[PDB]
Design a protein around this ligand. Structure first.
Ligand SMILES: O=C(O)Cc1ccc(O)cc1
Length: 317
């Protein structure tokens, strides 16, 4: 038998979040593959550290595996931020596979101080809140809790202000009144109790959040070659889908559930209103491209690679 391995996996979502049982099942299959030599415990609810610090927790050995939202740290990961632009993805499952295939090309530039396991997205989210927002300018003067740095840029472009908060901190920000509006996926509105705090919901696949699962290099490099192979075999597109597809399904189910509640107003946009949003969100691409160039990348090449992946997987809106 190999030297026994005991890993800690850190998440910043609660136990009822679909990623938690799915990640336990991933760990269980690794234990089965390794004949017991690799064991893990999954720590939800920020027990091991705050949401925003999860990349550094993997980098620095606080946890062996972490769930990361790169977009909680503005400017840190300019390439992966291409997936954060409004109106990119139509579907969580195919979008996860497209993002993962594309980003594995660039993760060695941008995430070289961890091992990237896989990248993924959520089912496209929506704008939820206390006001019936139809056009970009309706965010002017509103306080918005953005999902990631690109949505934060969008809020400022439209004359709102941001409320920086992680998913588990968002209900409290809305309840205290410091946020009027939130970009969130639909099932998570229920999971975090936000359905009791906001009643308006714009029925548009506005954006998604990009995520990574990151493994510490010291943790990985302490494995035997047989153990490394088992981890690598659990970091493939197959496993990106197995871990994240239940989350996609949960979030899409949330939208259908919300649309049946008589105390909520889930409203469509007109073609004219949606075009103002598509047209109005376009400047975010130049901001993205400038950040990539400043960090030493070629945004035209990075963007064409992502567009090719979207087309391959039929993942693009
Ligand atoms: O909007 C975010 O903060 C990202 C996110 C939202 C809901 C969720 O369940 C997980 C992450």
């Amino acid at each position: 038998q190999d030297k026994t391995v005991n890993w800690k996996v850190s998440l910043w979502v609660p136990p009822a979040h679909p990623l938690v049982p799915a990640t336990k099942a991933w760990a269980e299959d690794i234990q089965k593959a390794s004949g017991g030599s690799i064991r893990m415990t999954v720590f939800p609810s920020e027990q091991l550290g705050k949401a925003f610090d999860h990349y550094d927790m993997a980098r620095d050995g606080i946890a062996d595996v972490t769930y990361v939202n790169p977009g909680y740290q503005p400017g840190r990961f300019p390439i992966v931020s291409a997936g954060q632009l409004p109106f990119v993805f139509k579907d969580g499952k195919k979008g996860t596979l497209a993002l993962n295939e594309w980003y594995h090309k660039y993760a060695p530039t941008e995430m070289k101080d961890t091992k990237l396991c896989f990248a993924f997205i959520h089912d496209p989210g929506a704008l939820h809140g206390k006001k019936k927002v139809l056009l970009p300018s309706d965010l002017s003067g509103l306080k918005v809790r953005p999902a990631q740095s690109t949505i934060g840029e969008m809020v400022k472009l439209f004359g709102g202000t941001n409320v920086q908060a992680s998913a588990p901190e968002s209900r409290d920000a809305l309840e205290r009144g410091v946020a009027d509006e939130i970009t969130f996926p639909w099932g998570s509105v229920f999971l975090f109790g936000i359905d009791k705090v906001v009643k308006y919901h714009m029925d548009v696949p506005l954006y998604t959040t990009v995520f990574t699962y990151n493994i510490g290099l010291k943790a990985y490099n302490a494995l035997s070659d047989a153990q490394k192979k088992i981890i690598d075999d659990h970091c493939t597109p197959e496993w990106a889908s197995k871990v994240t597809d239940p989350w996609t399904d949960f979030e899409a189910n949330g939208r259908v559930k919300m649309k049946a509640l008589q105390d909520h107003e889930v409203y469509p946009l007109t073609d004219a209103q949606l075009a103002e949003w598509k047209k109005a969100t376009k400047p975010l691409r130049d901001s993205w491209a400038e950040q990539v160039k400043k960090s030493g990348g070629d945004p035209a090449a990075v963007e064409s690679d992502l567009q090719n992946a979207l087309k391959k997987y039929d993942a693009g809106l």
